[PDB]
Amino acid sequence: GAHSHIRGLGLDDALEPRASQGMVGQLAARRAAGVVLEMIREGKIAGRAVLIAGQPGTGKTAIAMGMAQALGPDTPFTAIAGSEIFSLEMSKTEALTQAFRRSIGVRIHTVSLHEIDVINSRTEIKSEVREQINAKVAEWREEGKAEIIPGVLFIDEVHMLDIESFSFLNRALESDMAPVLIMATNRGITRIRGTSYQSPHGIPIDLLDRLLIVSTTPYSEKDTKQILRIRCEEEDVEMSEDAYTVLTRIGLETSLRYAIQLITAASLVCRKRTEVQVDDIKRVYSLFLDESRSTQYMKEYQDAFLF
Amino acid sequence: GAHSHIRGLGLDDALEPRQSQGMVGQLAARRAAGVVLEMIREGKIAGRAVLIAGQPGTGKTAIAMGMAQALGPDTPFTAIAGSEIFSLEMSKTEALTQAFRRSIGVRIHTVSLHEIDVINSRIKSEVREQINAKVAEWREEGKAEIIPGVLFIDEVHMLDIESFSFLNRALESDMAPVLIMATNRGITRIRGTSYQSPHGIPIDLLDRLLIVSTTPYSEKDTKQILRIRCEEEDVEMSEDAYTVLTRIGLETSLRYAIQLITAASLVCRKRKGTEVQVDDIKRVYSLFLDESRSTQYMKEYQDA
Amino acid sequence: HSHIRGLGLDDALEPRQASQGMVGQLAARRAAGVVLEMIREGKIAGRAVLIAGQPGTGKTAIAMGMAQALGPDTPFTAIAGSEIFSLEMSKTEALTQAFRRSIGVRIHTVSLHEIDVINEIKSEVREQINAKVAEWREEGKAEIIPGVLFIDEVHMLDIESFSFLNRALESDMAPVLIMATNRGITRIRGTSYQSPHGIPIDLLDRLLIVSTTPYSEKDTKQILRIRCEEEDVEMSEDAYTVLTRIGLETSLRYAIQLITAASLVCRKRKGTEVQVDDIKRVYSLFLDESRSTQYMKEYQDAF
Amino acid sequence: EVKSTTKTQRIASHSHVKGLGLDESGLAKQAASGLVGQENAREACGVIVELIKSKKMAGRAVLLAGPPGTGKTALALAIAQELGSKVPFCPMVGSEVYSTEIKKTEVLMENFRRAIGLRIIQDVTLHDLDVANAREITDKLRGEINKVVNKYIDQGIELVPGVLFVDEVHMLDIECFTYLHRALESSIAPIVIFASNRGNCVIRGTEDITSPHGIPLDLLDRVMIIRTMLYTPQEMKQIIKIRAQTEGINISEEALNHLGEIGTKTTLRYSVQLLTPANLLAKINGKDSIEKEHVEEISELFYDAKSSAKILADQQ
Amino acid sequence: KSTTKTQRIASHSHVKGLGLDESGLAKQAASGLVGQENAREACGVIVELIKSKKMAGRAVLLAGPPGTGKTALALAIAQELGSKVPFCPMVGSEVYSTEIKKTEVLMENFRRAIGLRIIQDVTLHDLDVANARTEITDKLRGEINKVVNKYIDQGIAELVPGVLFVDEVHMLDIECFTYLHRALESIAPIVIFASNRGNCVIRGDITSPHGIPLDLLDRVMIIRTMLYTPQEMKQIIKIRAQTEGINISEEALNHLGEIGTKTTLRYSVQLLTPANLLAKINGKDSIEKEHVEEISELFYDAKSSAKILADQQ
Amino acid sequence: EVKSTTKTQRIASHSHVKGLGLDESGLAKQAASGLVGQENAREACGVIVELIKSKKMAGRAVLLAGPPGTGKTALALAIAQELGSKVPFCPMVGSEVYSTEIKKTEVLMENFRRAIGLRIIQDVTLHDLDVANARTEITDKLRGEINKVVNKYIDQGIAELVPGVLFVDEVHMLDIECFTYLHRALESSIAPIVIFASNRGNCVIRGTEDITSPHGIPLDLLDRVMIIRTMLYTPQEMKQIIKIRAQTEGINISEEALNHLGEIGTKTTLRYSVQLLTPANLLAKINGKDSIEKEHVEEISELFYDAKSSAKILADQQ
Ligand SMILES: Nc1ncnc2c1ncn2[C@@H]1O[C@H](COP(=O)(O)OP(=O)(O)OP(=O)(O)O)C[C@H]1O
Ligand SMILES: Nc1ncnc2c1ncn2[C@@H]1O[C@H](COP(=O)(O)OP(=O)(O)O)[C@@H](O)[C@H]1O
Ligand SMILES: Nc1ncnc2c1ncn2[C@@H]1O[C@H](COP(=O)(O)OP(=O)(O)O)C[C@H]1O
Ligand SMILES: Nc1ncnc2c1ncn2[C@@H]1O[C@H](COP(=O)(O)OP(=O)(O)O)C[C@H]1O
Ligand SMILES: Nc1ncnc2c1ncn2[C@@H]1O[C@H](COP(=O)(O)OP(=O)(O)O)C[C@H]1O
Ligand SMILES: Nc1ncnc2c1ncn2[C@@H]1O[C@H](COP(=O)(O)OP(=O)(O)O)C[C@H]1O
Ligand SMILES: [Mg+2]
């Protein structure tokens, strides 16, 4: 796993972020997420939704994973990408229905609405089965046999979604059984897919006006160093103290995502002859590019093509 | 009715405009409309069509109304906008089909072809097939007579080529209504095409049109139109206010000046006033906006 | 055509300027000859042909000669890129039909398409004939000779169309592919991406491109002569010069159109041969595309 | 005794709106019936409620044109509250018609049914009966209710057409507008108010064709336009104070003044939306009301759309 | 029953043929036609070509300004071709229908352009409708063809393929040109296209002359039409008035002819009927200079009417 | 009892590619295992081949970014060879998924099946077993039976499932829907290694129309992608590749003609140069020569053309 270290948000009793629960830095976004958790607990989350604005690799997925963990240890979490709704074997809304149903859990021991639906379908998924389970769970909830635990639906790259998909989200959040919708994006003012209109995050204004927007800023040299040290532990990789300094500087230069991609690779270069050194970090840097170098060389080739 | 005051074109047998029958001003278009009326009555209108080119609210809808009214009584009429044919419930052709079947009447009162279709609908294609062959059956006996009227298609620039091709086909019928079209746009591209053309109508159709042009009304011409509509709305107004409202009609819109009459009587009424005064007007103008002031206020916000 | 019976090449692969009907276009004919030997020796596997040049440089003519220099029984199908866009036919169905038309079976030679016609065509009929043709080839009763498939205006062909040709050339019974275009760097139809000759880059990498040079006075003269010697229309030497002059100011295709029209004015004037008078009058009567657009631009610009 | 389908969430932020708040002459008081300032728009909304009642709104529609957060939704709810209490109100957004699951005709029809009701006193709507007699709402399921409703009317066992608020009007395609125009022509139909924040806009379902607020001129001609204006920090502070009273949230004038000056830099919606998380952060901090530093914290913890769009763009 | 669309051929009633002498030279005024000599002479060559069976695969394009007899010439080609030849005048845009498909729109106009001599002069379409009258199908077409074919094999009837005139050709799409390509490649009629435009994008970025693709234009012969002299304008208007039965003065003819050169020949001719009715209301027999001047002021040409709106904006 | 349905006309120009040409320490030799030059990419490919063996490629794919004729499909074949003998390699193009007759879901599935195999001893792919049962078509129900049979052999302990390499070229030609299918099937344990190739920089993702991303890959998948760079060859490396290319073809050529064919590659592309070795050899067979001299090489370069040059010739004329 990649978020294997995350066990919550690591905030104290006053929701103040204490490095804790597998979290490193990102204090402003953690306390903000903590406020969302209290707004959920009271019951003021209804009508509203959450959005994590920030650059790629700034902890957006980790914070929502922490948000689900802090809510409960037996609570559903469904991480999906904007592009995942555009599938050959499925519909845009069929992927979104499955994403919502995966997030709503049933206590009897816990089981999501999707597992209950997938079981009865296999005995894609006939719509008649879904309308039945909905009425069935409603009676079970009424009598007191089953308890509904609304989970967390994390949708990253939310700028890929269209007006038809945002319409679905508005209809699904209208349910009482509805989970907490934590969206995320790397985009500013872009056009809303399916329309000729430009908007912040590529989200329509009718949904923006109900959003709890949080911001994630890139990590410092000290923050980046601990994330890579926590990854080395999770990947059982031994590295020299000055290799961390070179890897983090590369992690600041390019990305943390790429720095983590280098951890796995740089250790097998060390396994070719004890502890990963600066030259193993430097060798694997020339061996594997970062997207910013990959596009630069292609631009340099296409520039000389005009000469 | 928005045109309730119209009873005809207000023309003498010498086809000169009285400057009558509900009409005021627009001397040019009123005379040309009478000439067009003569062609229909003389049966020299087949293959041909009419097009009233003019700025919004300069007579076009009323001139076509007055044309249908002067052609005698019980003459069928249908006033549809170009955008009306684009429906979620209907099809582009089916919407125009119903507009054509509405402007064609049958006399024993005069029952339009669309009314007959209404009896056998919740209109299905199988329904029209039975009725059409039954009308020619009533034509052999001579019991019934086909009296087609006027189909006024305003905002014609909205019509695409699939619908313009349908018009050609629909106008080819022996029993066909007189097609009167209206637009405010000059050289525009034909919807569905890459090519430009005057009024957004295909080149082939313009070579059949009896194009008439409506010019803007002067202060004296606007004051009589506003007087007629005031009298039509049972709204007694001060002559000081008739001036202010006509000034708003010239500076803004006639469609807007008429829009303020209805609301001005209520402002006057609520303050237990006798007749509508200038301060009822100044207020209703400050309360309700006109598209020009409405858009400029939005343009002034976006820049900030 | 009706004059192109082959390339007109010697044992050492060298054109003669006037042999087997072919006139001029030496380098391109010799380039075309090298392809013939690659088809012959069996080294045309996973490769295709393209002929690039201005309209009327004998691209279609060289394609006609290649099949004729392959045998007098070898099938030939010359489709245009603008002909796959049909109302009564799918873009891939028109290409399947053109492919099968290019693949002949021996008894007498009969195309795989002519076998479908006797029996658009259903995908059920296709599996039937293919299963029967698989039996005759194994037994020895019939001989499947893969012919020549010429595709002019190939810049018209879309992304799916080119993706079809890839699966169709993956066959062992597949015919040879020869394409033609007068366009340089053009966009690949069905995409925003541009490429040389409007062809996907992965197919261009497989093409054996041949360039055609425009004909000179003497080169154009023999081409017109041969066609006049074909159309049963006799004309003066003074008229031949006038017709080449026109055919070089306009195009070769337009010059050939004036042969049929000038021969008519001649007979109606009670003449033996077609003089200059019958050519210049027939030049003013019927215009070329280049002259036609010039007057319309003059009128539509002011109107 | 039946159920209510009413969208609670959509009208939760407007609970303080009890009507228009206009005196006998027709003029607006600064603060009355839950509404603060917005005098000219409230006064113009008065004439509309008069026009509906005097039966002079035939084929006519309304448009509220102003910047986002300037009480467009509040005034349309005020018109419903002015005609009488329990008079149906339907708050929809233009983008709601674009669903893969349900057809464009089915979305709109439901809203019109939600906007027309009947007093049997049983204060209920046409759509409330639809779900009750389906406990799928089809062409056949609807018609069965229409005949049942007609039977109660004929004898005397009362139809009340309400208000259908269509926000983000420019989002609608030309075909959606025709559906509205034909429906607005009927006598038993409800007054349709539209809301925009744009000028000359390209009508959806077309290309090239631009029109005021992206509304076809066929419809736009039979439309009464009311302008709504940006609130001052002072007008805003009065709204943020009223909302806190309605939610039972205690707050200091110092925090309120800062919350009001945020409304200037953001929207009236954004500031009021901070009233709840700040009240919750005070709960954690063991304080009764919201201090000036609680508002300043929730302003640092949470962002508006434009601010977060700027951060991402400036970082890149 | 003759199902010919009467209205489409109402402005060309006077056209009896090309009016060329035994050799092939145009007279100033012959067979209803005035001026347009080079085009009329070039049409005669095509008349001899079809009769020589040398138009195999070849099509025609009459290109020039609107109202320069492009439709009139195409009608005369059918007139000259033989005794009552099936002339069908279609428009490129006619295929774009929501009701019926392009295929059936094209087939209908094609069947309208192929006749049959049995002396009974009836087209394939005037028999297609006779079979159905609910709608013309492909199996129904086979029924008429089975009848049509036996007549020749019994020697009773002879087939006559005619003229299919197509104006606004640039309006047809890529699929429509492929349909025509098969049709021309056959007892098929002569496809005569007419374009008032130059280099045009083929419907369905690929620009080409007259909107016709290069694959079809390789087998197309172009005959240019030209604008008329004010003396030719007076003649054509006088012919139309003589064919319509309306009296008009030469003083008014100069003005009505001048109006035509300024606008179009089609619009000036179409001004005769209103000018006639203006005079009838005044109890007159003929049309004077004032009657023309009034109608020309009352009515506008689409070119100058859209100019007023642009002037006002 | 077995028959493979591999498209050899796709791996034709890679007959000399035995492996990567690396040593024990993981460094590339100047010339080894059929590959010349491209040392940094070859050293990187080895690190990938080593990671697939350690099983530390979970949810990871590879991207080769470089100009045409830089050995992208060559290195991908060498990856499959260096994985082991008879390891399944399936090369495809982004265009291939587009067809009006065959649905894109089936095209992607066909190539996915060719990229996974079994080891009993007769090495064959899962697509070979799909067509064998069809004496007609391949449906989902047909695959359902074949998979149950294929798993039963592993459930008993007869044949090990050996997945290999799935090489995808012109990745910018794939659409947003195609990318989801790849990413969802990439997560699978028994799935092959997906190798992408790009001669483009920042590109508009197909289906988005407006959205741009590096190499036309939606960022969700590019985060899981390992990038390796391919560079243009030095004229020394150029002659070296063409030399082995002539030897494997069995074509004899002078070192002087090799110098002219080598300099043409630098001017155009390496792919174009190797594609001149067959028309030149057959030309010499007509003249009467058992080797290729500069004469034939200069002639074929003047008679036959590359995309870039011929397109420029038409541009001059028009
Ligand atoms: N000459 C007139 N005499 C009497 N009433 C008139 C005259 N001209 C306009 N009106 C009245 O003023 C109103 C304005 O509508 P009208 O002129 O008919 O619209 P239009 O010019 O056809 O274009 P739009 O419908 O507004 O888009 C309605 C009409 O009855
Ligand atoms: N004039 C006002 N008086 C009282 N509350 C107001 C006023 N204007 C707006 N509000 C309240 O402010 C919030 C945002 O306003 P809203 O009506 O939704 O604006 P809009 O429709 O223009 O976006 C709502 O809670 C609304 O009730
Ligand atoms: N503040 C933090 N504390 C603890 N671990 C952290 C961390 N920020 C990152 N990480 C770890 O590195 C991983 C980087 O991926 P990701 O965070 O999901 O990027 P994105 O913005 O797209 O959502 C995830 C997380 O486990
Ligand atoms: N080398 C030659 N020898 C003899 N006749 C020749 C000729 N090259 C051309 N022609 C004749 O002129 C015409 C030219 O067109 P075409 O051959 O079809 O090719 P393209 O696509 O470039 O237009 C047709 C052909 O009969
Ligand atoms: N040379 C001539 N002699 C006699 N009458 C003539 C004539 N040229 C035209 N006409 C007549 O004028 C009318 C308009 O010409 P039209 O055929 O429609 O031209 P276009 O296709 O470009 O639109 C109708 C025609 O019969
Ligand atoms: N380093 C090397 N050593 C030996 N031969 C090499 C080689 N690099 C390439 N080649 C050979 O050149 C030929 C064309 O190269 P290709 O792989 O298809 O181009 P692309 O980068 O786009 O994928 C075939 C290939 O085996
Ligand atoms: Mg050509």
PDB file of C-alpha atoms and ligand atoms in Angstrom, chain C residues 1 3-4 21-23 25 54-61 152 215 223 226 252 256, ligand 4:
ATOM      1  CA  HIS C   1      -6.563   4.647 -69.952  1.00  0.00           C
ATOM      2  CA  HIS C   3      -3.232   2.304 -73.576  1.00  0.00           C
ATOM      3  CA  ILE C   4      -1.429   1.251 -70.339  1.00  0.00           C
ATOM      4  CA  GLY C  21       2.045   2.585 -73.624  1.00  0.00           C
ATOM      5  CA  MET C  22       3.831   4.436 -70.753  1.00  0.00           C
ATOM      6  CA  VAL C  23       5.359   7.861 -71.616  1.00  0.00           C
ATOM      7  CA  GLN C  25       7.798   9.497 -65.665  1.00  0.00           C
ATOM      8  CA  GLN C  54       0.339  16.888 -58.335  1.00  0.00           C
ATOM      9  CA  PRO C  55      -3.002  15.900 -60.060  1.00  0.00           C
ATOM     10  CA  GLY C  56      -2.328  14.358 -63.488  1.00  0.00           C
ATOM     11  CA  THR C  57       1.248  13.088 -62.919  1.00  0.00           C
ATOM     12  CA  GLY C  58       0.211   9.497 -63.807  1.00  0.00           C
ATOM     13  CA  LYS C  59      -0.212   8.165 -60.217  1.00  0.00           C
ATOM     14  CA  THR C  60      -3.297   6.116 -61.305  1.00  0.00           C
ATOM     15  CA  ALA C  61      -1.521   5.244 -64.627  1.00  0.00           C
ATOM     16  CA  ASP C 152      -6.639   7.444 -54.702  1.00  0.00           C
ATOM     17  CA  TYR C 215       5.255  16.385 -67.383  1.00  0.00           C
ATOM     18  CA  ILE C 223       0.144  11.336 -73.500  1.00  0.00           C
ATOM     19  CA  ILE C 226      -1.912   8.170 -77.298  1.00  0.00           C
ATOM     20  CA  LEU C 252      -3.857  17.059 -68.330  1.00  0.00           C
ATOM     21  CA  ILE C 256      -8.410  15.030 -72.464  1.00  0.00           C
TER      22      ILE C 256
HETATM   23  N1  LIG G   4       2.779   8.394 -68.105  1.00  0.00           N
HETATM   24  C1  LIG G   4       1.531   8.394 -68.841  1.00  0.00           C
HETATM   25  N2  LIG G   4       1.447   7.761 -70.002  1.00  0.00           N
HETATM   26  C2  LIG G   4       0.317   7.768 -70.698  1.00  0.00           C
HETATM   27  N3  LIG G   4      -0.777   8.395 -70.269  1.00  0.00           N
HETATM   28  C3  LIG G   4      -0.791   9.032 -69.101  1.00  0.00           C
HETATM   29  C4  LIG G   4       0.417   9.062 -68.342  1.00  0.00           C
HETATM   30  N4  LIG G   4       0.121   9.810 -67.220  1.00  0.00           N
HETATM   31  C5  LIG G   4      -1.139  10.182 -67.331  1.00  0.00           C
HETATM   32  N5  LIG G   4      -1.619   9.715 -68.400  1.00  0.00           N
HETATM   33  C6  LIG G   4      -2.995   9.975 -68.820  1.00  0.00           C
HETATM   34  O1  LIG G   4      -3.442  11.328 -68.474  1.00  0.00           O
HETATM   35  C7  LIG G   4      -4.394  11.164 -67.329  1.00  0.00           C
HETATM   36  C8  LIG G   4      -3.690  11.500 -66.042  1.00  0.00           C
HETATM   37  O2  LIG G   4      -4.316  11.076 -64.858  1.00  0.00           O
HETATM   38  P1  LIG G   4      -3.907   9.655 -64.107  1.00  0.00           P
HETATM   39  O3  LIG G   4      -3.089   8.775 -64.933  1.00  0.00           O
HETATM   40  O4  LIG G   4      -5.112   8.840 -63.981  1.00  0.00           O
HETATM   41  O5  LIG G   4      -3.149   9.878 -62.657  1.00  0.00           O
HETATM   42  P2  LIG G   4      -3.435  11.092 -61.577  1.00  0.00           P
HETATM   43  O6  LIG G   4      -4.033  10.635 -60.326  1.00  0.00           O
HETATM   44  O7  LIG G   4      -2.228  11.807 -61.167  1.00  0.00           O
HETATM   45  O8  LIG G   4      -4.347  12.131 -62.048  1.00  0.00           O
HETATM   46  C9  LIG G   4      -4.927   9.759 -67.418  1.00  0.00           C
HETATM   47  C10 LIG G   4      -3.977   9.018 -68.241  1.00  0.00           C
HETATM   48  O9  LIG G   4      -4.734   8.400 -69.326  1.00  0.00           O
END
